[PDB]
Design a protein around this ligand. Structure first.
Ligand SMILES: CCCCCCCCCCCCCCCCCC(=O)OC[C@H](COP(=O)([O-])OCC(O)COP(=O)([O-])OC[C@@H](COC(=O)CCCCCCCCCCCCCCCCC)OC(=O)CCCCCCCCCCCCCCCCC)OC(=O)CCCCCCCCCCCCCCCCC
Ligand SMILES: CCCCCCCCCCCCCCCCCC(=O)OC[C@H](COP(=O)([O-])OCC(O)COP(=O)([O-])OC[C@@H](COC(=O)CCCCCCCCCCCCCCCCC)OC(=O)CCCCCCCCCCCCCCCCC)OC(=O)CCCCCCCCCCCCCCCCC
Ligand SMILES: CCCCCCCCCCCCCCCCCC(=O)OC[C@H](COP(=O)([O-])OCC(O)COP(=O)([O-])OC[C@@H](COC(=O)CCCCCCCCCCCCCCCCC)OC(=O)CCCCCCCCCCCCCCCCC)OC(=O)CCCCCCCCCCCCCCCCC
Ligand SMILES: CCCCCCCCCCCCCCCCCC(=O)OC[C@H](COP(=O)([O-])OCC(O)COP(=O)([O-])OC[C@@H](COC(=O)CCCCCCCCCCCCCCCCC)OC(=O)CCCCCCCCCCCCCCCCC)OC(=O)CCCCCCCCCCCCCCCCC
Ligand SMILES: CCCCCCCCCCCCCCCCC[C@@H](O)O[C@H](CO[C@H](O)CCCCCCCCCCCCCCC)COP(=O)(O)OCC[N+](C)(C)C
Ligand SMILES: CCCCCCCCCCCCCCCCC[C@@H](O)O[C@H](CO[C@H](O)CCCCCCCCCCCCCCC)COP(=O)(O)OCC[N+](C)(C)C
Ligand SMILES: CCCCCCCC/C=C\CCCCCCCC(=O)OC[C@H](COP(=O)(O)OCCN)OC(=O)CCCCCCC/C=C\CCCCCCCC
Ligand SMILES: CCCCCCCCCCCCCCCCCC(=O)OC[C@H](COP(=O)(O)OCCN)OC(=O)CCCCCCCCCCCCCCCCC
Lengths: 54, 99, 347, 53, 56, 459, 121, 140, 69
């Protein structure tokens, strides 16, 4: 009950996935809303799409 | 307190207002008729009628048909000296094996 | 803003989109894009405040850059073929420029930031019109030029869109930002199916437009722009919350609701072309969208949040303005799964 | 996506400008009028795939 | 009176009429699958003098 | 099947148009009538299925599940009217509407003839269940329980959708009859391994499989009584029905791919019985008993012999009835004392005699007591597993011993002993509760009388 | 775009003249009845949103909802049936014209076909 | 990118372990460079030296993961004499995950990365064997 | 019971035959449609996947300023 059901079967599948999704969501949505920053990102994306996609 | 919240109400007992309560409804007449219809339909109709209907369902699984067919085949085969259970399901003449 | 000026600006936006969708010439398509943007800026800035001004500024910068790149692609294509007709593009570099420009116009990742920023900045009516119509036009251009789309680039941008939409929507609390990230994810799905069946792209567009119209009009009806503002709606008009809950379930792709049909048809079509990894990843990633839809539904309908004291006066008063086609949008966004084979009519 | 209002109504809004072999003012010929005419005539009515092949 | 009874107990016929309609629709669905009627190798037989079909 | 589908879709307007005090009476009466009508589906053929039309068909595996669903609806109505007395009329009608929609989806799920229609319906069953749980649950954890249930089921089922559309593109049809007649062996390759995994994992999450089961205690503990009754009685049987249906096309790869699932099922059966031994909550004890029995059914389906399939079907029906009865009894106790702790209320045999009798009968059926259909199914599964290998008997014997231990432990803790002194609100049992227990228990004994009706097509 | 650009296709034509040779949908079609059901649901939702009695008020409005939905549904069904008939026609014509691509195959009975047997034990 | 992938694939699976390690290290370095470029774009550094330090850290982490993966997979296939076996790629993926955990100083990150990267690498090997394609060419 | 509620086995048998025939015809049609779509998209010689080309009615054949077109 304690070691497997309440702890490790919770940690492997549902808890780890939820933690990963929460961290990725924080990373994606934590933006300062600066046009300078995301336009520099646009420039990098344009360069990458030009060079790596033939 | 952090809210204007109602106090948790006391448990309501159906036996206090209606000593002969069946536990279905507050209104005595509705409660009595709910009991009557539930008991009648469920027990009488469903239990008795469905059980007897299932008991006397026609033998569509062909259990007795299969038993009679097996009796006939056993009689015919042991009368003529043939094996009771055939060795092959299909005909090796009609089966063509690869070279 | 004068009502006549507002209606003529809306007519000009629609005229620009229609010029894009009827033109057979690249110059006329570009003219339609320019007309749409020019008439769309004041619509964003209709209710004047610094947030609206900032949103309009960012929208203008992004759309102007996209138009410049698109015209560069048109000129490069003319250089190597001497053709102005909108068909398969004859230069791969021009095609890549066109694809990136149209992706930036649509808000596909990694060109997505402006979508949540602008949607939060502008009002509910402005956000509704933005999402719907401004997705409508570039998708038509992409459908016309579909046969020369680089599948690798298009599918990469689509998968990025789905992932980014899911994660952003997970983090957000503002309803307009939630709707923006939902739009990003749905655009990802549409452009993912784009290189295979433009009919499936159009079907996804129509279902998404119906669901978005229903959701935005429910938000306008309840006058809710945040989660907690939406949490008080059960105490004034509980029916609106029930309709919003079923619409949110539909947007998450739950069967047998209408939002399952586009996902189902797109997965089927992609699997017909021997795509399995992409449909499986796309299907699994939509669980993030469903999670934040469900989190929004818990606050509004399935649980009762605390209310305030002036809600009694709000009870005493009655809603005046009538939303146009809201019941029709709510029905079409939840109960059209049995009518699926009409996509042949849409063909 | 593409609503061919021009073809449906018999109008001409940009088809005059689509190609350089069409009617030009004062009958000024293009630089590659003959080649463009030959390619268009070859590729007419067979579709994109057969046109490219 | 009697009018109030029907005003309240007109809903008790909904399920029975639904059952009747369902039986009718089952018959209608059966009558469209009469493509191998009296044509299976196992059950093919000559029609009786006063019957048109083997089953309905 | 329309003669059964349409009366439910007529239960809807009748419920919404009936008077404020006649809703329960009308719903119960007409649900019982629909159950009586659905009893006519048990007349099956020995050769093939009942092919009603191009859309719905019935077999010896579908018929008992349909009868169980239709019989289960009125019992849920009785329990709901127990615990929803102070609700408004509109919310009562919405509750009945959710129950009716769930029953309709389950009926069409069991009678669907295509795998894709089956998928659509068996995924549509989630919405009413989620709404019921997260809306009419009592405690705080209902929201987390709904999230766990929903996302487990969907993460299982989406690869199933991809695999189904792939199989249709490959073979031309998803019709069950066609794929049974045009079945071809599955070669041992990675692609076939992953198709097998997609289908089986969807239904294993629905079962549930040990290690994929936490959503079951979460949802069953936190759902209202009707939600708990339907979740254990019927919704756990969708996974078993799906596995008994899809494994037609997964051979011979099932011979090699079943080892991890068989080991998981056997060891998790032991583990969940042991967990039941040390549970402080009654609903959690019942939920883990459900997990153990469904693990046994998974073993039966995976070993996949004609003797195992009959055992699987019999055990599914028996577990549905027994778990529903146990949940109802626990709910009556909860309504007495407003708590789920097992040791809070004791001496309920000296305070409530007939309820003690019902507890005894339900606990006796929960363990395999002959000649109950529970024992019939468990014994068939054990025999097939013995023919499979000769240490499965060791595992099954351990499981039976622990099952008896925890069932009788629950009975002794709740009923026997001395009553708690300060609990003085234990009113005499209601006729409604007693009738509910009787309607749970009598059909089980009648099924024991006639056991060939629930042994599946392989009989 | 599969059937876009098909030869002889008149632009912006919801239903061409060649669709008149197909059987029109029956007025009692289950799909038409479902369109009517959608219209009725829309009317009920309209009453609920405007806070009128859901089943009683606005009978004329509910009738208009149902009628409009049935009208558009009838025309939509006609177009859908025509498009599917067109697809079948094109597929059959292509199979007929490409016999080397769609060759008839000799049918071998199961007595001649060899299939491996995998025991279950 | 395509050239680097083609070089890695053109090196035979069971031989030239140093060449496999070099190719995988180059791929990892390019991936880390792209990630560092995006990180600098979206979260600007406080200084040029801090930006260069972050770029070096990301690039070295990626290159180390690639080198460990390539070395472990090639060595495992060579010693087991079993090319076209997903187990080699699983071992390489878990070794890369352990490298990531060591770089980030986190046992939990290391374990999760080992599991996920091992599954991903095994899936990549199975796809190479079976002809699975992520961006399928349009047809039908 | 058999007289009142149920029908003979022939009805179910022959309905099953009709259902199987319909489903087999549908499966054959689906596979054939997939093959036809694949060939038409690959080759471009059928009514489907006919992407537009420039109309030759636009070309001006009147004599130009320069003799060599
Ligand atoms: C971790 C240690 C470990 O391997 O534990 C396996 C072990 C399985 O039991 P077993 O008796 O050792 O397996 C028999 C043979 O080892 C393996 O059997 P075999 O060698 O005869 O061939 C069959 C094998 C064929 O091998 C493969 O297919 C391998 C290729 C990759 C498979 C990826 C599976 C993805 C789908 C499942 C995702 C969730 C997990 O089948 C599988 O691998 C089945 C994959 C699914 C396993 C169970 C999934 C549910 C887990 C629930 C608990 C989660 C916490 O435990 C688990 O899988 C669960 C705990 C670890 C997670
Ligand atoms: C209220 C509305 C009804 C009022 C009363 C009837 C007024 C009209 C009377 C009339 O004209 O009758 C003649 C007409 C007889 O047609 P027929 O010409 O003899 O049929 C021969 C046909 O040629 C060939 O017929 P077939 O058997 O080949 O049918 C083809 C069928 C083949 O389709 C399939 O195989 C798949 C069907 C399901 C697809 C989607 C599954 C996943 C989504 C589930 C639902 C999501 C939304 C919730 O495909 C379709 O029908 C396409 C649409 C699918 C849905 C059809 C629904 C029909 C009833 C419309 C109202 C439903 C209301 C439901 C809720 C009620 C609440 C009070 O009767 C009807 O159509 C009446 C149908 C039953 C009405 C009562 C409600 C039953 C609801 C059953 C739900 C489950 C099924
Ligand atoms: C009927 C079966 C339907 C099956 C599904 C089909 C699709 C839906 C049906 C179409 C839409 C119906 C109207 C929706 C709004 C209703 C509002 C309302 O109060 O209604 C009460 C209304 C009567 O009350 P009233 O005195 O007029 O006004 C009371 C106030 O509204 C009282 O106002 P209030 O302030 O007290 O309201 C508070 C209440 C307000 O709550 C509501 O308004 C809930 C209902 C609306 C929610 C959204 C409905 C569905 C919209 C489409 C979405 C997809 C549907 C399918 C989903 C599948 C998966 C779940 O809020 C709550 O209770 C909040 C807590 C619960 C929230 C969580 C649960 C949400 C469930 C959402 C899904 C429900 C689906 C089933 C439909 C249920 C309603 C019929 O009753 C009806 O409208 C009954 C339905 C119509 C019956 C027509 C009968 C005609 C004559 C017999 C025909 C026989 C058959 C024909 C053939 C001929 C045979 C002879
Ligand atoms: C077909 C379409 C084609 C489109 C492309 C066209 C290409 C041709 C272009 C032709 C010429 C164009 C002329 C116009 C350019 C206009 C530039 C401009 O106005 O920039 C304003 C912009 C900011 O203006 P501001 O705000 O007044 O200046 C702030 C101060 O700098 C004070 O700043 P702070 O105190 O905050 O820090 C200083 C510094 C701090 O800077 C950093 O932290 C960046 C550190 C970069 C390290 C790069 C290492 C590269 C290694 C390569 C591989 C070898 C092995 C390495 C192994 C590991 C080694 C550790 O900067 C920042 O923090 C600002 C954030 C952005 C920095 C990086 C900007 C470049 C793009 C992003 C990627 C950077 C490289 C990432 C690594 C990956 C490389 C593949 O200035 C800059 O970004 C730097 C100066 C301009 C350089 C332009 C170079 C050409 C770009 C093209
Ligand atoms: C003598 C003169 C008589 C004239 C008679 C009138 C002739 C027709 C006039 C049509 C109206 C005038 C033009 C106004 C716009 C026309 C729009 C429509 O008619 O055009 C058709 C378009 O019809 C619509 O596409 C079908 C609408 C389908 C609506 C439902 C979509 C299906 C959703 C699936 C679920 C359904 C749920 C239930 C829905 C209620 C076909 O046009 P087409 O040139 O070829 O399109 C080109 C673009 N393509 C190729 C990419 C497609
Ligand atoms: C976490 C997810 C759940 C846990 C994983 C479930 C158990 C997996 C156990 C490994 C399966 C081993 C088997 O399936 O594959 C063997 C090798 O396994 C693979 O190489 C590894 C795939 C990824 C395994 C993930 C689990 C980690 C297990 C690590 C130890 C298992 C390997 C033991 C030595 C083989 C080779 O067997 P083979 O007879 O060729 O049949 C393959 C099919 N063929 C014939 C078409 C090729
Ligand atoms: C598919 C199923 C695979 C089965 C293996 C599952 C992973 C097993 C390892 C999990 C145990 C590790 C651990 O406990 O710490 C996880 C650790 C710490 O977070 P906690 O706060 O402890 O989580 C608790 C949330 N309430 O979080 C992480 O998972 C690390 C992040 C993973 C790195 C990213 C994965 C990289 C994979 C790349 C290819 C994809
Ligand atoms: C009043 C309130 C609003 C609801 C109105 C509902 C009825 C609307 C239609 C009225 C009748 C129109 C008509 O003439 O229909 C006939 C037509 C079939 O006729 P036809 O096919 O020519 O003949 C049979 C050939 N074998 O029939 C059809 O084509 C049927 C198409 C419509 C299907 C509608 C399905 C039901 C919708 C819900 C109705 C609920 C009514 C509840 C009323 C409550 C009042 C308090």
């Amino acid at each position: 009950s304690s070691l497997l059901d309440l702890i490790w079967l919770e940690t492997i599948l549902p808890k780890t996935t939820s933690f990963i999704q929460m961290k990725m969501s924080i990373m994606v949505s934590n933006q300062k809303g600066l046009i300078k920053l995301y336009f520099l990102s646009f420039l990098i994306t344009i360069m990458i799409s030009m060079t790596l996609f033939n | 307190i952090r809210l204007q919240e109602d106090p948790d109400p006391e448990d309501e007992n159906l036996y206090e207002k209606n000593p002969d309560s069946h536990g279905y409804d507050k209104d005595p007449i509705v409660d009595l008729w709910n009991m009557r219809v539930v008991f009648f339909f469920g027990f009488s109709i469903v239990l008795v009628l469905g059980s007897t209907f299932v008991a006397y369902l026609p033998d569509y699984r062909m259990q007795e048909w299969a038993r009679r067919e097996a009796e006939r085949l056993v009689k015919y085969r042991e009368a003529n000296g043939l094996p009771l259970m055939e060795s092959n399901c299909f005909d090796p003449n009609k089966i063509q094996l690869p070279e | 803003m004068n009502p006549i000026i507002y209606t003529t600006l809306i007519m000009t936006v629609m005229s620009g989109t229609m010029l894009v969708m009827i033109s057979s010439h690249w110059l006329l398509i570009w003219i339609g894009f320019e007309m749409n943007l020019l008439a769309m800026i004041p619509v964003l800035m209709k209710n004047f405040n610094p947030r609206a001004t900032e949103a309009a500024t960012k929208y203008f910068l992004t759309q102007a850059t996209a138009s410049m790149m698109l015209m560069m692609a048109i000129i490069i294509n003319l250089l190597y073929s001497g053709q102005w007709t909108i068909t398969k593009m004859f230069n791969p570099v021009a095609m890549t420029m066109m694809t990136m420009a149209l992706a930036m116009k649509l808000g596909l990742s990694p060109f997505h930031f402006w979508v949540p920023e602008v949607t939060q900045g502008i009002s509910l009516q402005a956000g509704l019109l933005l999402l719907t119509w401004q997705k409508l036009a570039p998708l038509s251009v992409l459908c016309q030029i579909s046969q020369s789309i680089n599948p690798n680039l298009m599918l990469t941008m689509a998968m990025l869109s789905i992932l980014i939409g899911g994660w952003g929507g997970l983090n957000q609390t503002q309803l307009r930002k939630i709707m923006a990230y939902s739009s990003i994810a749905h655009m990802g799905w549409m452009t993912a199916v784009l290189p295979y069946n433009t009919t499936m792209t159009i079907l996804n567009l129509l279902i998404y437009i119906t669901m978005t119209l229903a959701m935005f009009m429910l938000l306008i009806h309840s006058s809710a722009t945040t989660t907690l503002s939406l949490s008080h709606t059960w105490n004034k008009m509980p029916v609106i919350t029930s309709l919003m809950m079923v619409t949110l379930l539909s947007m998450g792709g739950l069967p047998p609701l209408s939002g399952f049909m586009p996902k189902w048809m797109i997965i089927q079509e992609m699997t017909k072309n021997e795509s399995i990894i992409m449909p499986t990843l796309m299907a699994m990633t939509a669980l993030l969208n469903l999670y934040f839809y469900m989190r929004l539904a818990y606050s509004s309908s399935l649980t009762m949040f605390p209310s305030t004291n002036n809600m009694k006066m709000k009870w005493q008063f009655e809603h005046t303005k009538q939303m146009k086609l809201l019941p029709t949008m709510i029905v079409l966004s939840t109960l059209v799964l049995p009518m699926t084979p009409a996509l042949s009519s849409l063909n | 996506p593409f609503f061919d209002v021009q073809k449906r109504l018999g109008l001409d809004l940009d088809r005059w400008m689509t190609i350089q072999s069409a009617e030009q003012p004062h009958k000024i010929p293009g630089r590659c009028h003959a080649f463009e005419k030959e390619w268009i005539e070859c590729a007419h009515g067979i579709g994109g795939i057969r046109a490219e092949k | 009176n009697v009018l109030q009874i029907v005003r309240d107990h007109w809903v008790h016929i909904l399920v029975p009429v639904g059952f009747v309609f369902g039986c009718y629709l089952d018959r209608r669905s059966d009558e469209k699958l009469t493509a191998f009627r009296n044509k299976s190798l196992l059950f093919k037989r000559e029609l009786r003098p006063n019957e048109e079909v083997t089953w309905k | 099947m329309l003669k059964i589908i349409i009366p439910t879709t007529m239960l809807l307007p009748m419920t919404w148009m009936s008077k404020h005090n006649m809703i329960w009476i009308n719903a119960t009466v007409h649900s019982l009538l629909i159950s009586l009508i659905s009893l006519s589906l048990l007349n099956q053929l020995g050769e093939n299925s009942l092919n009603f039309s191009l859309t719905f068909f019935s077999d010896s595996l579908s018929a008992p599940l349909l009868v169980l669903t239709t019989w289960l609806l009125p019992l849920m109505l009785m329990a709901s009217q127990s615990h929803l007395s102070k609700e408004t009329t509109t919310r009562k009608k919405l509750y009945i509407t959710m129950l009716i929609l769930l029953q309709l989806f389950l009926i069409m799920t069991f009678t669907a003839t295509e795998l894709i229609l089956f998928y659509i319906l068996f995924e549509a069953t989630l919405v009413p269940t989620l709404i019921i749980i997260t809306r009419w649950g009592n405690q705080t954890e209902r929201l987390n329980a709904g999230l766990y249930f929903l996302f487990y089921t969907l993460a299982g089922s989406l690869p199933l959708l991809v695999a189904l559309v792939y199989i249709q593109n490959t073979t031309g049809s998803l019709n069950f009859l066609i794929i049974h007649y045009w079945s071809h062996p599955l070669s041992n390759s990675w692609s076939n391994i992953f198709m097998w995994l997609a289908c089986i994992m969807a239904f294993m999450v629905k079962m549930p499989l040990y290690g994929l089961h936490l959503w079951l205690p979460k949802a069953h503990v936190e759902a209202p009584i009707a939600g708990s009754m339907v979740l254990a009685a019927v919704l756990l049987k969708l996974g078993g029905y799906g596995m008994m249906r899809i494994t037609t096309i997964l051979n011979p790869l099932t011979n090699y791919m079943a080892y991890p699932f068989l080991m998981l099922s056997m060891w998790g059966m032991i583990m969940t019985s042991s967990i039941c031994l040390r549970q402080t909550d009654l609903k959690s004890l019942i939920a883990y008993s459900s997990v153990s029995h469904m693990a046994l059914v998974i073993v039966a389906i995976m070993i996949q012999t004609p003797w195992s399939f009959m055992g699987a079907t019999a055990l599914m029906i028996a577990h549905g009835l027994t778990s529903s009865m146990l949940f109802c009894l626990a709910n009556t106790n909860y309504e007495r004392v407003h708590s789920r702790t097992m040791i809070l209320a004791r001496g309920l045999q000296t305070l409530l005699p007939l309820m003690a009798t019902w507890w005894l009968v339900a606990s006796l059926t929960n363990l395999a007591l002959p000649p109950s259909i529970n024992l019939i199914g468990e014994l068939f599964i054990i025999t097939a597993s013995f023919s499979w290998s000769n240490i499965t008997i060791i595992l099954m014997g351990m499981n039976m011993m622990i099952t008896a231990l925890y069932s009788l432990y629950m009975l002794i803790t709740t009923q026997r002993g001395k009553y708690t002194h300060h609990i003085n609100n234990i009113k005499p049992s209601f006729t409604r509760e007693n009738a509910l227990m009787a309607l749970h228990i009598l059909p089980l004994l009648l099924l024991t009388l006639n056991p060939k009706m629930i042994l599946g097509p392989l009989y | 775009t599969m059937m876009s650009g098909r030869p002889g296709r008149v632009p912006l034509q919801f239903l061409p003249n060649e669709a008149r040779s197909l059987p029109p949908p029956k007025l009692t079609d289950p799909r038409l009845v479902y369109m009517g059901f959608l219209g009725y649901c829309s009317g009920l939702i309209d009453n609920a949103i405007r806070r009128r009695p859901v089943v009683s008020a606005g009978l004329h409005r509910q009738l208009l909802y149902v009628t409009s939905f049935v009208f558009f549904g009838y025309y939509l069904l006609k177009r859908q049936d025509y498009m599917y008939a067109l697809r079948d026609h094109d597929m059959f014509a292509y199979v007929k014209s490409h016999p080397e691509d769609f060759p008839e195959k000799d049918k071998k009975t199961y007595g001649e076909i060899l299939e491996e047997f995998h025991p279950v034990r | 990118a395509k050239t680097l992938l083609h070089k890695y694939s053109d090196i035979p699976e069971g031989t030239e372990c140093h060449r496999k390690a070099y190719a995988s290290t180059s791929i990892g370095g390019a991936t880390g460079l792209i990630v560092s470029a995006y990180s600098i774009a979206l979260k600007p550094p406080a200084s040029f030296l801090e930006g260069v330090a972050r770029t070096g850290r990301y690039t070295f982490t990626s290159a180390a993961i690639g080198a460990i993966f390539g070395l472990t997979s090639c060595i495992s296939a060579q010693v087991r004499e079993k090319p076209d076996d997903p187990l080699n790629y699983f071992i390489g993926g878990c070794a890369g995950g352990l490298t990531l955990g060591a770089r980030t100083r986190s046992y939990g990150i290391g374990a999760a990365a080992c599991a996920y990267m091992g599954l991903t690498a095994a899936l990549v090997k199975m796809g190479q064997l079976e002809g699975w394609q992520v961006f399928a060419e349009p047809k039908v | 019971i058999a007289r009142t509620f149920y029908d003979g086995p022939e009805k179910n048998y022959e309905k099953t035959m009709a259902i199987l025939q319909i489903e087999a015809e549908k499966a054959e049609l689906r596979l054939k449609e997939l093959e036809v779509r694949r060939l038409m998209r690959a080759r471009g010689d059928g009514p489907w996947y006919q992407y537009p080309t420039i109309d030759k009615a636009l070309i001006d054949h009147s004599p130009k300023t320069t003799p060599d077109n």
